[PDB]
């Protein structure tokens, strides 16, 4: 708003996985107030990923988010008779939020049966750097880099 | 409304289910609260005038 910033609400660390990250994904996939259901889906996906790989699910998630972390956005502006996109830098928190939203959205509309295996496959693809979120990040990066001339 | 309809309601009706409740101040047949027997607008005016024991403005 016009009257300065608004502090962001804090989060708690999950007893099962002591990191704010897992709570962040639960919050992002939470819909209709079913926090327990979101936790169940994320735990099933993480257990599936651990079953398929062997390494720690939080480490796989960290690899995935580091791979899908973007650098610049393409926020647009209009001055006169035309509108053009302006590539600007992104803060780490905003980049993490955008990548998590992209991952969740692409896992929601995948061609599988349940979100356990859907999110397991999505996080594994993001960890290996070949998934839908990675493709979206590459597209955003290149289409923003194509507008480097208008960098005011 | 109509005083003829008021008298018709007040009288003892054949096929008693034909009866109905109206306002005790103006005879409005709608929005009549059985606790008081007045219509909605008359009830509001009476509450503002403060002539109902126990009825007053609510804030919560």
């Amino acid at each position: 708003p016009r009257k300065g910033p608004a502090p962001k609400r804090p989060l708690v660390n999950d007893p099962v996985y002591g990191s704010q990250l897992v709570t962040q994904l639960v919050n992002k996939v939470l819909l209709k107030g079913k926090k327990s259901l979101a936790e169940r889906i994320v735990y099933g996906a993480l257990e599936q990923a651990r079953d398929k790989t062997g390494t720690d699910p939080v480490i796989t998630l960290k690899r995935a988010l580091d791979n899908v972390k973007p650098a610049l956005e393409v926020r647009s502006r209009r001055v006169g008779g035309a509108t053009y996109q302006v590539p600007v830098e992104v803060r780490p928190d905003r980049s993490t939020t955008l990548a998590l939203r992209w991952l969740v959205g692409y896992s929601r509309q995948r061609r599988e049966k349940t979100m356990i295996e859907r999110l397991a496959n999505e996080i594994l693809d993001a960890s290996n750097g070949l998934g839908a979120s990675v493709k979206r990040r590459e597209d955003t990066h290149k289409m923003a880099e194509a507008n480097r001339a208008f960098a005011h | 409304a109509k005083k003829a309809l008021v008298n018709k309601a007040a009288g003892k009706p054949r096929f008693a289910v034909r009866a109905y409740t109206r306002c005790s101040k103006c005879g409005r047949p709608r929005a009549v609260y059985r606790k008081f027997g007045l219509c909605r607008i008359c009830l509001r005016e009476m509450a503002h005038a403060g002539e109902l024991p126990g009825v007053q403005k609510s804030s919560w």
Binding site: - | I41, R44, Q56, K57, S58
Partner: protein, 50 residues
């Protein structure tokens, strides 16, 4: 509804409070019960002997 016509969004609410207490189990001594039935409280409060 605050308005007499067509303005449904103008509403005023009212509360009817009623306070109950003094449910004591005082003994039915004849002198005190006669005194109690002889004394009378203002009509704003309702007495009920059980």
């Amino acid at each position: 509804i605050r308005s007499p016509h067509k303005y449904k969004d103008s509403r005023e609410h009212f509360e009817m409070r009623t306070h109950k207490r003094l449910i004591d189990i005082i003994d039915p001594t004849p002198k005190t019960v006669d005194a109690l039935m002889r004394i009378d409280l203002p009509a704003s409060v309702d007495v009920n002997i059980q």
